[PDB]
Amino acid sequence: MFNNHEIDTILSTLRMEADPSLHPLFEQFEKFYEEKLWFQLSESLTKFFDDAKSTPLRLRLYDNFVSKFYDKINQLSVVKYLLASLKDSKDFDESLKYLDDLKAQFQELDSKKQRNNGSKDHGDGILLIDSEIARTYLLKNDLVKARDLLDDLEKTLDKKDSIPLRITNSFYSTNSQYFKFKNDFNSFYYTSLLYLSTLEPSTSITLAERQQLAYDLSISALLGDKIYNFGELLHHPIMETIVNDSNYDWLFQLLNALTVGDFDKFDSLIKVQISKIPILAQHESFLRQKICLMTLIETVFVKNIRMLSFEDISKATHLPKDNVEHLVMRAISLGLLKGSIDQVNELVTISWVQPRIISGDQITKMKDRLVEWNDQVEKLGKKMEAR
Template structure:
């Protein structure tokens, strides 16, 4: 009976002869013979991820004739990643599903993180089949594993990354857009941008922008602007979406109207927007109102309806409805004086701020510090006994 070592040696020698330019095969044999499992894992991981080393089905064969011989000696999370990369090269999705399903029978060896990783990878392959049954299985994985993923400790973000990739892909297919938006943002939190292919960045930036603009309950655009993802839209047909995101973040009604006119043809090709035009217009009006409140010092937040109408470009008779809508969405808290046509705003929903907005905050803090100093000087001059302890 041929030993595993002999089989491995014969396979790697044959591959090295077939592909002499791929010197990694010879190095693999050296590391395997020396039982240097960590270094071998690094080399195999790098090899399977590099598209330049792909020759037909050589990487599928690498698993079948080599990796399977020592997979138990690998770091199991790294093994799960290697296996997933190889499955992406399978000719049929069903073959990838079968291989991962078989591997998941070894959960005792895999451990929690590698198991979750492979279950999420399996979910992604199932979503690609467009089968309702497979989609339901992927949904079950998302529901069952969310708590486990959120409870993971450590610095490795590999498992959360693939989990949120799965969940955001699922919600992109079935909706609602706000669920996709939330989990796609979490994917960005856990995923280094350089690890995402350029084409996927472009698609993700487009989808995130559309979800932010059309999704219910999304009024904090700074979360996306704080990531580099929108740079993927630069110099592309969807560059206007990046501008639209910044317009919404600033609550710029006039800028919104300009973009709608300038890019009418491109916008007409986006059913996510055209199907919710009235909602999108309502959202930009609410954001314009929120920005107006933000611009006001905390002690000057009694805002006249006429000023709100001017800022939002709404008829005066629609302002009260807009304010009540903002309150119902918990974007602001305050009291409406219908007689005086004024709203006293006591609270504004926190948002992620850009540099310009942060500079405004710094300016207000400086003003507040100056007023406190003036008050202190006044008290020292007029009522020094109050400052004695």
Template sequence: MSSSSVATRRMDVGEYLRQQQQLAANTGLIEWWTTFEELYTKRLWHQLTQKVYEFVRTVPHPNLLDFYENFIADFETKINGLTLIETCVYIVNQLPSHESRVVFLNKLSEKVKANREAAILCNILLGQSMLEAKDLKGIKDLLETTNELIEAETGVTAVHSRYYRLSSEYHKLVGNHCEYYRDALRYLGCQTSTDVEDADTQAQRAFTLALAAILGDNIYNFGELLQHPIVNTLRPEHRYMKDLLLAFNSGDLTKYEALRTQWLQQPDLAQHELQMRQKICLLSLMEMTFNSTNGIIKFDEIAKQTRIPINEIELLVMKALSLGLVRGSIDEVEKTVHLSWVQPRVLDKKQIENMKKKLDIWFKDIDNIEKLLEKRAQEIIN
């Protein structure tokens, strides 16, 4: 079917409904068509819209484009723009080619441009078709345009999750780990009850997210992913990925090395072994900074924790400072680093416990200083 087939011969609505009733007489679907005729005749547009949407979602129909052209198109101006696009999702899925979908969606887009959510959803459907056709330039431009519409929305709408899913799929296709990780997490955060995915899809998304987190250049926060239920959907052969994420999250070189024989079986990880090592060393330094009570850490302590030569410690700290992972200074004479800040992260239970212990120490120190001041003040008064 060519793109020209999107335009079909329009017939009178009454004639079309009678024709469909005759065709459905022996199929058990005639009730649908008599209901359509009744609601259309009475001009009960809301009830008719609901019935049409239920029909396209639940009843197998060989030619929904014909249904749209000869019936829905007659009263589509009476339908809420977003509901119209939601209904047309099923029609678009029946169109056999990217060209025919583009023609149909472009016409539809003009009809709903006054409704921002409907316009966004129309763009998303067009983007999905572009993704299937591997039109990477087209989908990149479309995502940028649609992002402006998304940003203008107040709160989370019905189209946010589908936009972020489309965007994450595009970034996955072009190999952009950081952007994929960001938008895939946003998708998970915006999911609604209608965004139901099968177990295989969830498991694949969990694995891809884990890979993106580990391989993404600017990703040093794994807590949000680790706390999401999706990590528990990993297939048995990929369960080591959760342990690997935990090792990175806490900068645990021992656990990282213990998992080496497993993650080396994954080609993407084996290919980036050097980058992974550098990343977990930076995370280890972040963890040391977080656990330090006074922010002063010796070079030899860092060398022991990260397992790198002491003459490379300064380079590691400078890298962390340049990436904005920590803030502080290096004392080359004393061979120490003074770190006063570490990049905020989503903490796991163990990290929260360490923070509690640190706060307890601080409170104790404050209490001691308070008592000392009271004692000194009393001495002065006396």
């Protein structure tokens, strides 16, 4: 089964009259790899549904066929694949050599053929240069120089309107790589959800890259409690789509660890890399009390009595009683919760934090509170109607 050797060759001879102006090097390079299964930039038609990470031999060949690719199949093969797919080849010898192709060559095409949208559909003439602006400083030199180029891409995100979401996700991909190696992973976890949450057409990756992306999603929520908790990614097709071993279960074990409240149980199943950072242990205690903080409205008591004892959250968060006053104090400083506390009576009252998507016994009690609203219609409401 040869996709690029035969299917790509036969279908190329059928379209664009007879051949797309094939040079003698075209058929010579197809016989180079033979059964080694090296597709190497399948060149439009096949390349849409077929990806190749091997080092292309034809990189300097199809460059003269770009004008033929437009009249053959589609112009999206250049912007969504081919020269834009060079990042999948993982060729270090081409580093910062693509400015003459992925930038300067596309700049000359934008000043001649396509002025704004060109012809056919949209998505061409914008994502060409805009994708590689921030991708220039991702590798090699530090990400500090890339931050100045991220704001220019965010301004064109809301201004430009495109039907496919691959252009929008291409802007958040550079934002994720910026906060990946830096601190403040709350922004990394925020840009990762907007990059991919559930999108079928956009962000098409193999099975091996889904677990690698899930690894970045795992380490994103370790250092911060924002946007729900580790259990938020469980409802999304993330944890259910990955294997439960090889340290990919970190997001699953921390969900049940909130109710158990023991760090030693989770520390025994992990390595020294993630267990040496105290930020993981500190920000995990905020989520453990958070479950008890959501009990202030209705959980057990049916009378809606709001009271919080420091002894109940002590065993839940694995923290002593004297450090409870400083635990809730850091929550207000970071803007996690709003409210007032009382040290004399040991009572805590909060307005709200981020009420979760949880269901079952929660939605059952939610209906009971609305019954009291309807009970006044049968009690206080019917008396005013008789007046």
